[PDB]
Paper text:
[name], a [name]-activated [name] for Rap GTPases, is a major transducer of [name] signaling and a therapeutic target in cardiac diseases. Another major transducer of [name] signaling is the EPAC protein family, comprised of [name] and EPAC2. [name] has the same domain organization as EPAC2, apart from the replacement of the first CNB domain by a 50-residue domain without recognizable structural homology, suggesting that its mechanism of autoinhibition release shares common features with that of EPAC2. We find that anionic membranes activate [name] independently of [name], increase its affinity for [name] by two orders of magnitude, and synergize with [name] to yield maximal [name] activity.
The structure shows that the DEP and CNB domains are connected by a kinked helix (residues 154–181, with the kink located at P171), which is sandwiched between the two domains and entirely mediates their interaction. We note a single difference between [name] and EPAC2, located at Gln 270 in [name], which forms a hydrogen bond with the sugar hydroxyl of [name] that is not seen with the equivalent Lys 405 in EPAC2. The potential to form hydrogen bonds at this residue likely contributes to the distinct selectivities of [name] and EPAC2 for [name]-derived agonists. The structure confirms that it lacks a positively charged pocket that could accommodate PS or PIP2 headgroups, such as the phosphoinositide-binding pocket of PH domains. Combining our EPAC1DEP-CNB structure to a model of EPAC1CNB-[name]/Rap1, we then built a composite model of [name]-activated EPAC1DEP-CNB-[name] bound to Rap1 and used it to examine how [name] binds to anionic membranes. We identified an extended cationic tract at the surface in the EPAC1DEP-CNB-[name] model, comprised of the polybasic loop in the DEP domain (residues 75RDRKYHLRLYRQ86), and numerous lysines and arginines in the CNB and [name] domains.
Author numbering: 50 to 101, 105 to 150, 157 to 305
The structure:
Amino acid sequence: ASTERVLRAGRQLHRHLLATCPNLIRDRKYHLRLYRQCCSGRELVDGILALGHSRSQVVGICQVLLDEGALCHVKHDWAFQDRDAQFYRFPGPEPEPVEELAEAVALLSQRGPDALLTVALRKPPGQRTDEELDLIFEELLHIKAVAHLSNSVKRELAAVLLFEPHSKAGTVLFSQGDKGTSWYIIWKGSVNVVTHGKGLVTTLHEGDDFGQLALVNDAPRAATIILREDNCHFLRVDKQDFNRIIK
Ligand SMILES: Nc1ncnc2c1ncn2[C@@H]1O[C@@H]2COP(=O)(O)O[C@H]2[C@H]1O
């Protein structure tokens, strides 16, 4: 969690919006509903652009603020909406009025693409827009484990790929001898490969994959997979999809 810096970055941005867009955060009436001291997502993005390269970048910045609590949706939704009908508030107490803004924009922009990729991934398979599938596809272009596959194939994987986050190191993902149900790509983190006979046989890092032996050979898992770091993030492909798309 880099939550503390996002917050102060958000706090820093929040100060320059009130100064540059004095009527961005106001009372609003939508469908005869009244929302106090809020802004629309679409106008929030607009205002961030007005400060002074792309809209998708700014959308990523907003997603990052929503994620770290530096921005909160009126209707408690987790995907940021670049829309007129969606309203957001800054939280925390009012900050003091107004290079620090520059580095606050950079820190937020650095995390934007991942924030937007996570939203696409958190969308269950079959409920992904072409734009979300577009984001997941471009990510597979950066994964060593699938580089030898065709774009058509990567596209198929994007359609069925499953997002599987974890938090604690030392978690046993599956054990030697278990029925093999799924293929795994390491988006973030690393894992230990442990066999009963030799102990730690190897370490896999971001961009590697594991768990195909059990699917390809119709056999029990040949090793225990243990999370080596905090916050491992996996892309998972279930057996049926793996077999249909990789056999
Ligand atoms: N030396 C190794 N022995 C066995 N499995 C390994 C080894 N190195 C990496 N692996 C991976 O560990 C996985 C454990 O489950 P699988 O047998 O399905 O697929 C295996 C491989 O992807």
